[PDB]
């Protein structure tokens, strides 16, 4: 019991940031960012090979998201060259 | 039915993004995000109940924590002013 | 002088690592985003001063724009409480 | 003066939101978060240029810095394969 509620703050931050401490600590994060109308890579591939006659499998559902987005149809919330299914895309101007 | 590989791609496009069409659409985004050595605001109350002795329960850990927050002893990833335990904090400055 | 390109990479990064290195560190990153039709606090208030009749001065479409948010006809980004002229918002479900 | 103090305010809304209202919109923007010991991708290339012997010009420094990267002893704040001047890093793991 060397650490109590009279000891002075910053030192018991600085327990807390020591290594080996046992706090949990974590390399990664993930935030919320509200955009009206976004929607995630799978889903659409998903709606693709449902929706859209002619893929012999789900695979060449990709293929055809993939293309999508090189056409600008459907954009990257944040800018990558490469399709991903875990990433989030929203339309393109389709005026 | 109405749409296969043959229909051109903006026509594709367009049709998925109409109401209704079945596409799962939100009005939210997930970001992942690489910073090392953060942490969320639950392990840092457990972190504090477990290991500072005098708070009779676990309510008093959590107010010791927002405390730590007013003070800058920890930060919040995005500036905001409530403590919660949900979101994800770094180290001040401690020297 | 003492790093070359015949120095190992492990131990120019490191060097470059140290403090007093010169390398411009800072405690924040900024991240660019894609988000059809969002819009600064600051275009809102200059929208509602020069097109809604009745503002004596500019701080009382502040205010109203403040009425936006508490009424979820705009909405935060990133979900914060306090409206400011620097944040970016978006439109709330208006139907 | 069609828009007043004393319309109700969701119509305010409608009218801001319509096609040429006058209303200053987005399709970009710019986040800013909190973390500890980040870097520019241009400052990296700068630093080496600099202080590392060898380089016939700065062309030459960028291509190391994509070097380092590559090996893991700089990483990406969200993940992307290429190395950009304008995206910003943090350290690896240099134990």
């Known amino acids: 019991s060397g650490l109590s509620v009279h000891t002075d703050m910053?030192?018991?931050?600085?327990?807390?940031?020591?290594?080996?401490?046992?706090?949990?600590?974590?390399?990664?994060?993930?935030?919320?960012?509200?955009?009206?109308?976004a929607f995630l890579g799978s889903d659409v591939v998903?709606?693709?090979?449902?929706?859209?006659?002619?893929?012999?499998?789900?695979?060449?559902?990709?293929?055809?998201?993939s293309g999508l987005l090189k056409a600008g149809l459907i954009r990257h919330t944040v800018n990558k060259i490469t399709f991903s299914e875990q990433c989030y895309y929203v339309f393109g101007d389709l005026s």
Chains 1, 2, 3, 4 share one sequence.
Do not use: C, Q
């Not at 600085?14 to 955009?35: H, Y």
């Open 46 to 65: 998903d709606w693709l090979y449902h929706h859209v006659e002619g893929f012999p499998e789900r695979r060449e559902a990709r293929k055809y998201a």
């Open 10 to 37: 910053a030192s018991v931050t600085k327990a807390m940031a020591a290594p080996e401490s046992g706090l949990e600590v974590r390399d990664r994060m993930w935030l919320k960012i509200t955009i009206p109308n």
